[PDB]
Amino acid sequence: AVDFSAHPWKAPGPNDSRGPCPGLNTLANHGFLPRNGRNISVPMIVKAGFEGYNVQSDILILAGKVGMLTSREADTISLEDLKLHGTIEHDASLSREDVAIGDNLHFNEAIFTTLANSNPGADVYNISSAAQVQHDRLADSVARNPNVTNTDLTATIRSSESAFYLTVMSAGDPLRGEAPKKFVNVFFQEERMPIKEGWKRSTTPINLPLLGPIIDRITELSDWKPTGDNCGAIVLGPGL
Amino acid sequence: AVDFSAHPWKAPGPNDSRGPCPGLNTLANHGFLPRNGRNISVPMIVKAGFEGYNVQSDILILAGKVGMLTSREADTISLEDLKLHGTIEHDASLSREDVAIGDNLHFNEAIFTTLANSNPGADVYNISSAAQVQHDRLADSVARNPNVTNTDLTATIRSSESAFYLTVMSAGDPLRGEAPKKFVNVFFQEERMPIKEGWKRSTTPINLPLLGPIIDRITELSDWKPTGDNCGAIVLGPGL
């Protein structure tokens, strides 16, 4: 079918567009998406997500078209466009800072420490660990960011993203909702598929039916509460 | 090179997809967009809006990508998809009914009578008339629709739509914010470019700089006030 030896990892160059998403960045770093990270359409994301991760079109079409809002182009984005705050990009990221008090675009090792330290005693991250991380990340934003946005919508996106790293970077069936720390850490830290370390694309399709109960369970265990107005309104386009 | 004589009006057939937008319906009825009203992308809308109306890519890209959310496809819609309540489609339409209490899709003459009767004594609709109509239409939804939604966002979209019919169906410079009743009525009632009646595509580009002050003025004269939730959250995709 598809050859991963034909999709080598290469570090992004100075003019390669990268965004706040390790999922799409990794695909770009492997040429599943254009290495320059530009002129990326939803069909390209669908194909790239399938080929790279076995993530199905249901979630990628839905998230894809929302992400398209971040650009000024008709049907494409640069990966960096996705940093636009309040479309998808949200406070209390796993590996980026809140835009009001820092860089919401680039990987940040200090931020990532909370996740990297989660689930002490196991060699995997799992649903309970992901939930604790989300709780701790949100508490941090509430403590240090007086403009924190925390809504039903941001909470759901956050849980989705956790479900993604648990499933896409899994060793076993993605259903189990657990992934080796060695895989997940390479994914975030280097935005690389950890092939060397033993990772293989899931042979189980990762789609909304599979992700949905993982997402809800992460949310449930995270002891989440809304902030302020709880308005789930998205930013519809740049420079508004 | 655009030839309007090569773009005759034809009535939609029973299986030609039509939506709640007279702008896009008219383009389809003239073959500027596919006559079947299916498989329509943002680039196609951009080109069709330029060719047909001299509406620029700035507004069509922004509106277009929001409209894309209404389908289950990667990068296209049917025109009917746009009826999805709470993405763009809203209560207090000029020519459709509120979805909670009627058909939010098709032209309705009874609804349209408020607009058709506006600006008594002149042969044009203008900013003040458009504002009065919006005020009256919203009062109608507040009176008769127990599920009425009225937000900053819906109010602004409504004013945008009014600005569109004032500008795209204009005889003079679209800047003036006035259009012959004969043109606007055919546009809504038949979803036809009133070529026979003397209408010609604007030679002035219709873009956000031009529309913005018209929109704000319509809003201002309309004596609009928030009435409830006022959360400008859009529906992000169908069947949620």
Ligand code: HEM
């Ligand atoms: C298999 C597909 C994907 C995976 C595995 C994935 C993975 C991730 C993960 C783990 C995060 C969290 C990063 C963090 O909190 O620091 C994230 C964030 C993000 N992803 Fe994705 N993603 C995928 C697809 C997409 C798509 C298709 C889009 C856009 C359409 C997207 C847009 C984003 C954005 C904007 C963020 C930033 C959220 C934030 O932290 O503020 N992702 N992604």
Ligand code: HEM
């Ligand atoms: C760029 C893509 C466009 C999209 C996605 C779009 C979408 C929509 C939608 C979904 C509605 C229904 C809102 C409602 O009344 O509840 C609507 C209404 C309308 N659109 Fe468009 N439209 C677009 C372009 C245009 C253009 C170029 C015109 C030019 C005349 C136009 C004129 C209107 C008007 C007058 C209405 C109001 C109909 C009413 O209140 O009864 N639109 N549009």
Ligand SMILES: *[C@@H]1O[C@H](CO)[C@@H](O)[C@H](O)[C@H]1NC(C)=O
């Ligand atoms: C996650 O792993 C830890 C340690 O192995 C364990 O205490 C916890 O029950 C696990 N939770 C889930 C959901 O598997």
Ligand SMILES: *[C@@H]1O[C@H](CO)[C@@H](O)[C@H](O)[C@H]1NC(C)=O
């Ligand atoms: C839609 O259009 C694309 C490109 O114009 C074409 O490849 C495809 O066959 C079309 N599909 C439909 C829905 O007819």
Ligand SMILES: *[C@@H]1O[C@H](CO)[C@@H](O)[C@H](O)[C@H]1NC(C)=O
């Ligand atoms: C609209 O037309 C009416 C009647 O001709 C007139 O009284 C009013 O000044 C006009 N409004 C605008 C904004 O031009």
Ligand SMILES: *[C@@H]1O[C@H](CO)[C@@H](O)[C@H](O)[C@H]1NC(C)=O
């Ligand atoms: C509409 O409003 C009524 C209250 O008058 C309520 O019973 C009903 O749930 C609402 N319908 C929708 C669509 O939520």
Ligand SMILES: CC1=CC(=O)CC(C)(C)C1
């Ligand atoms: C201002 C405005 C006008 C529209 O018609 C669409 C959208 C996206 C709501 C933006």
Ligand SMILES: [Mg+2]
């Ligand atoms: Mg973030």
Ligand SMILES: [Mg+2]
């Ligand atoms: Mg409506």
